[PDB]
Amino acid sequence: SKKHPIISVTGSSTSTVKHTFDQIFRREGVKAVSIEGDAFHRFNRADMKAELDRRYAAGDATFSHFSYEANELKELERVFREYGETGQGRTRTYVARTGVAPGNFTDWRDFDSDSHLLFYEGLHGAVVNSEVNIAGLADLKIGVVPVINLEWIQKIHRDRATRGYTTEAVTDVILRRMHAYVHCIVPQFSQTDINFQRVPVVDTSNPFIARWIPTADESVVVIRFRNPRGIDFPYLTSMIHGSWMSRANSIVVPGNKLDLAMQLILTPLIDRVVRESKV
Predict the structure, then answer these.
(1) Which residues take part in binding ATP?
(2) Using CA atoms, how far apart are residues 195 and 224, in angstroms rounded to an integer?
(3) 163 in helix, strand or coil?
(4) Closest by alpha carbon to 260, among 276, 244, 236, 279?
(5) Which residues are annotated as a binding site?
């Protein structure tokens, strides 16, 4: 919080994004602890793969990694709570030497000491729901989201590179995810302070026969600010070559220039944040 700021990126897990924040915390001397959003899935691979066959026997084509039930959500809240006040907490790793195993959660760590901020990247960094309020504990909430068409392509590609005897087809994997996508993911993009939305400017009208993922070059990113006060858009459009404004509060930026728009944009918020913690 004010004295232990937590920054929270929700929606994305490609992941160009971490390198960018790293580049800034290094550029600015911000000693940072971090949470990989995978670390708070309720189930390891077997448990979940199993959790899904119980469901599909009951009549339940709505459970996925997007649903709240599939995530240690209030632990994630507890930790965001704990960082704010004291600067301690825990994290796992998943997605890794401990003995490891692909498909298993490593063991919980105490949070390092003398941290300027915590950093979270995943699909639930701004959850607000009836049990847990995770948006409310983070001083900066960023959303990095693709247009639905491009999430499917992004997903159909991860799932044509690791099969199994699944018996569920991409159509059924894609639809089964819509339920928790519209119920748990979509709403979060009204909790965030700044959204970056990745929009392909190539044909994504049938995501299911997409032979490859639209590269950065073949997309634009809309960067919308919840509140555009203080923001100097001419500065920004001068600096980011190729950009223009679509509304009074959002800049469109060629997709090969995300990394630079994040630096130009985020470098000063993370400073104004690291300088009010020590004041």
Answers:
(1) 11-16
(2) 5
(3) coil
(4) 236
(5) 11-16
Domains of the chain are: 1-279 (3.40.50.300)
Catalogue the long-range contacts made by 70-74 (C-beta closer than 8 Å, 24 or more residues apart): 70/41, 70/42, 70/43, 71/40, 71/41, 71/42, 71/124, 72/40, 72/41, 72/42, 73/40, 73/124, 73/127, 73/129, 73/131, 73/132, 73/134, 74/131, 74/132
Secondary structure of residue 92 in the 3-state scheme: coil
Nearest in space to 96 (alpha carbons), one of 14, 36, 11, 48: 36
CA–CA dist 148, 73 (Å, integer): 24
Backbone angles phi, psi at 180, to 5 degrees: -80, -15
- Experimental structure resolution, Å: 2.5
Determined by X-ray
Burial (CB count <10 Å: 0-12, 13-18, 19+), residue 267: middle
Annotated binding site for ATP: 11-16
